[PDB]
Paper text:
In Escherichia coli, actin homologue FtsA anchors the Z-ring to the membrane and recruits divisome components, including bitopic FtsN. In E. coli and many other bacteria, FtsA is the main membrane anchor for the cell division ring, the Z-ring, which initiates and organises division.
The 16 FtsA monomers are organised into four tetramers, each containing two short antiparallel protofilaments comprising two FtsA monomers. The IC domain in the open conformation is rotated downwards by 13.8 ° compared to the closed conformation, as analysed by DynDom38. Several hydrogen bonding contacts are lost because of the bending when compared to the straight filament. Importantly, our structural data reveal that the FtsA double filament is compatible with FtsN binding.
Numbering used by the authors: 8 to 389
The structure:
Amino acid sequence: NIIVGLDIGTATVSALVGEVLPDGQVNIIGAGSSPSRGMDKGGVNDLESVVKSVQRAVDQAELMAECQISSVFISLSGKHIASRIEKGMGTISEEEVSQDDMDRAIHTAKSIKIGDEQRILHVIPQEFTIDYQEGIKNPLGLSGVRMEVSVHLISCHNDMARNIIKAVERCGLKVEQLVFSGLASSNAVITEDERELGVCVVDIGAGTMDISIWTGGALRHTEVFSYAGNAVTSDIAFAFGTPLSDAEEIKVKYGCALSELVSKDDTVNVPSVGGRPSRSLQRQTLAEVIEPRYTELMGLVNQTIDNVQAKLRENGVKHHLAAGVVLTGGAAQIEGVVECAERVFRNQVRVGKPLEVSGLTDYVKEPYHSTAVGLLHYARDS
Ligand SMILES: Nc1ncnc2c1ncn2[C@@H]1O[C@H](COP(=O)(O)OP(=O)(O)OP(=O)(O)O)[C@@H](O)[C@H]1O
Ligand SMILES: [Mg+2]
């Protein structure tokens, strides 16, 4: 009937509500945003401050939709998120692969020993195989005698998840499921065509770099880094002697990811501390600090793609991501990301926004909303 998201981000908390229409298309009924205090690297850092932030967005969203919120789908990220790939097996009773046969094979590959510190988050079947026929998708009706699956397992640190759950539960809400941020950030920015050719998505944000790699129409790997937009924000402050509050504004209003797209005759007013006059500083100099960090950040994604690409072809599956890299999130909005990305990467870079948003489209237009609407796409499926 009604579905609710909750992207508890490192900087802003987004909360969307929508209703499932009979055909399937979900239209958004109400949005909600609020700055988040007490957050760092996608994890909880001050429990009482994030609880107030979650209530700020959930109350304004319950009001913009004329309905009471009771259950939510929440996102989750952090360096602790890890991915595993495990194979399984199963018999095909009465030579027809019924759905009861399909979950048994998944159950076998899913049942492993991980420990208590690890919490299972996603079990994503990649490519099936049915008697010398490999790489089949949805074989619901293929006559065979036995089948093996290659499930993709997403796991996260359990304790860091309990904190996020505790925050939402203290507002009278019930959590439905935890969702990896980059997975939702990919479900709402990608077209099915791009998935099959091969793509790399990255939720560039305040404190998290949520990477998801897709080849052959299946999620292959997921990795997260803790250096994000808050790193370049600090670099501006620490290099010019300007307060963090002011250094953020200079980043959003005059920041450039390449120190050659800005003209020498451009200047910015960077303030000072102590009671000093605000100096007028070259706009090129500002971009000269943002450029090295973005290159290093994308260098981590490049090193991740290469390590996944190597171990991918070495096992016999689609390895080269054709559609390229898709950038999203807040810190992907700076002028010149596609230019500095195309230098460190050598694949198709774009700054994809949420797609096919229905109704109330003015609040789900910018890429920093992708993770939020992606929670709706995931919740739409059951
Ligand atoms: N125009 C802009 N140019 C450069 N950076 C920007 C711009 N607008 C926003 N940002 C950066 O985007 C970041 C916020 O990202 P975003 O809102 O997507 O994160 P979030 O949802 O709060 O959390 P998460 O860390 O989990 O992605 C901030 O670090 C901010 O500096
Ligand atoms: Mg986010």
